[PDB]
Amino acid sequence: GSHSLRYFVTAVSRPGHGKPRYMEVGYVDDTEFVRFDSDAENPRYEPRTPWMEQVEPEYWEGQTQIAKGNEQSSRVDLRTALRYYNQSAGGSHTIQRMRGCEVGSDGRLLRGYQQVAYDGRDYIALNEDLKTWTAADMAALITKHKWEQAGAAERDRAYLEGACVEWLRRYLELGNATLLRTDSPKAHVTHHSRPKDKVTLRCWALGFYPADITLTWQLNGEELTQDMELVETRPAGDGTFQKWASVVVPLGKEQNYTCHVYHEGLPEPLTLRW
């Protein structure tokens, strides 16, 4: 498969109410594994999975120091943006950054990411070539120039192609048991009679990982789109995911509809009927 290591950074100003709130979150493959929270009684990077607890203590202190530098920086950034955009004082504003690498099963870099949003909108992003920037606006053009002049892109390229990839591997081998597992969905169909002569068929998928799944309903032998609902895929909170798709069909015609569940952890897709 392909895997990714990703860092998500949030800074939120709260004028009058003290210094900005600041957070960093690390993800391996969409599992949260490290976190830095300024609200902590004693803020610092900490492990978020049992498997992260086995790394050298040298690991943490260093990363904590890096996060603290990021937090002081981000506080300056919030002030900077207010100035670039000429925004009124006294409101809350947010900076977000995502940076990470996505690597194919051959250990090669498929993609490196470096991007920033201000107040929830694209601000600046490192292009796929890992050498040039895309500024979303006038304000971001000032950062683009600063960053070119400071040789930021090359610092980022080096990290994304080297360290980012190298640590992904440590982490993968570290959380071995649980990161690479597959839990296939357990499926079933429920049945409900609504007004007039309608029946709701709900096709359920539970306890699966990874999150990626497809559920479809077929009438006679082709898929449906109207009379259908599917909920966004959701965490059970224990590392598995849930989804369902329902369809409304005529009463006494339930037997003509089948539900199909597609998931990598299945020797082949599931077919259910009421």
Binding site: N70, S73, D77, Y123, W147, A152
Partner: peptide
């Protein structure tokens, strides 16, 4: 591993 971020 996280790195340090460039100022805006």
């Amino acid at each position: 591993i996280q790195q340090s971020i460039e100022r805006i």
